[PDB]
Write a protein that binds this ligand. Structure first.
Ligand SMILES: [N]S(=O)(=O)[C][C]C1234B567B89%10B%11%12%13B85%14B%1158B%12%11%15B%139%12B%1061B%12%112C5%153B%14874
Ligand SMILES: [Zn+2]
Length: 258
C-alpha cells in the first residue's frame, strides 16, 4: 500500500508515511499575482543547456523521467534567486485527466493542463542524494503547459511513451535537447518549498516561469495513455498525478518582473 494519487493513497494520505507533508514550506502553492512582490534585486535566470546529455526515459509508476548525465557540469541553472550552480538531473511532468487540471502550482487559482519540472541539484553538495538533505539543495524550474499549438520540441518525448507504457519500463533516450521545452520569456516567480512527491523534503528553491508553453491536444493525450500500473496488472491510466496547492504559511513569493 504505497503512496500514489488515488482515493486511498493520494495526497491527503501522504502525511501518515511522510509527516513533513504538513510542514512549513510545502509545495506546490497558489501564486497570488497581486501579492507576489517584484524584487529588483533578483537576477535574470541563467539556463545553460547547450551541452545537456540525456540518457534515458523511465516510467517510475507516478510520472516519466527524462534523465541526464549529471557527472560533469554541462546543463546548469544559476542566477535568478540562486547562489552558486545547480546541475540538471532529470525532468518530468504532472498532468490531468482533462485539460482543465493537471498543474501543481496555480496562478490566481488557475490550473494549467500540465506542468513541467526540470530538477537541478546544488553542486556544492556533491550529489543529488546529499543535496535533498539541505534547505538550498535543489532548484526546480517549473513551466506550465496549456493546450493549443503543438510544441515541436516535445514530440520526441511523446513518441517514445508507447515504449514505456507501464511502471518500471525504461528506454534509452539520448540527444534530447531540453531547450526545446522553454518558453520565450524567462520572467519568473520564486519561493522556498519542497519536493511535491514523497519524500516531500523541504529542499527546493522553486522558480516558476510566468509564460506557459503550448502543447497540442494530441501531445497531452499521449501522456494520458501511460499507466501507473506494471505490465500484466490491471490498467490504471496515468492521469491526475498532481499534488494540489498547499498552505503558503510564513512565505513570500517574489517576482522577477514588474
Ligand atoms: N515533483 S518534484 O518536486 O520535482 C519531485 C521529483 C522527484 B525526482 B526522483 B525522486 B527525485 B525525488 B522523488 B522521484 B522524482 B520524485 C522526487 B525527486
Ligand atoms: Zn514534479
Amino acid at each position: 500500500h504505497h503512496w500514489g494519487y488515488g482515493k486511498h493513497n493520494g495526497p491527503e494520505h501522504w502525511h501518515k508515511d511522510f509527516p513533513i507533508a504538513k510542514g512549513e514550506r510545502q509545495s506546490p502553492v497558489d501564486i497570488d499575482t497581486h501579492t507576489a512582490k517584484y524584487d529588483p534585486s533578483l537576477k535574470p535566470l541563467s539556463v545553460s543547456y547547450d551541452q545537456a546529455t540525456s540518457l534515458r526515459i523511465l516510467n517510475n509508476g507516478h510520472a516519466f523521467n527524462v534523465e541526464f548525465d549529471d557527472s560533469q557540469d554541462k546543463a546548469v541553472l544559476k542566477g535568478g534567486p540562486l547562489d552558486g550552480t545547480y546541475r540538471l538531473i532529470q525532468f518530468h511532468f504532472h498532468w490531468g485527466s482533462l485539460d482543465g487540471q493537471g498543474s501543481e502550482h496555480t496562478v490566481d487559482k488557475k490550473k494549467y493542463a500540465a506542468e513541467l519540472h526540470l530538477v537541478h541539484w546544488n553542486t556544492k553538495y556533491g550529489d543529488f542524494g546529499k543535496a535533498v538533505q539541505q534547505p538550498d539543495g535543489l532548484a526546480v524550474l517549473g513551466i506550465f503547459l496549456k493546450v493549443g499549438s503543438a510544441k515541436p520540441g516535445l514530440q520526441k518525448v511523446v513518441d517514445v511513451l508507447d515504449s514505456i507504457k507501464t511502471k518500471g519500463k525504461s528506454a534509452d533516450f539520448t540527444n534530447f535537447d531540453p531547450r526545446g521545452l522553454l518558453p520565450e520569456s524567462l520572467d519568473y516567480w520564486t519561493y522556498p518549498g519542497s519536493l511535491t512527491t514523497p519524500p516531500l523534503l523541504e529542499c527546493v528553491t522553486w522558480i516558476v516561469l510566468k509564460e506557459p508553453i503550448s502543447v497540442s491536444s494530441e501531445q497531452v493525450l499521449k501522456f494520458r495513455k501511460l499507466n501507473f500500473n506494471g505490465e500484466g496488472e490491471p490498467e490504471e491510466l496515468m492521469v491526475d498525478n498532481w499534488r494540489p496547492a498547499q498552505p503558503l504559511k510564513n512565505r513570500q513569493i517574489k517576482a522577477s518582473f514588474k
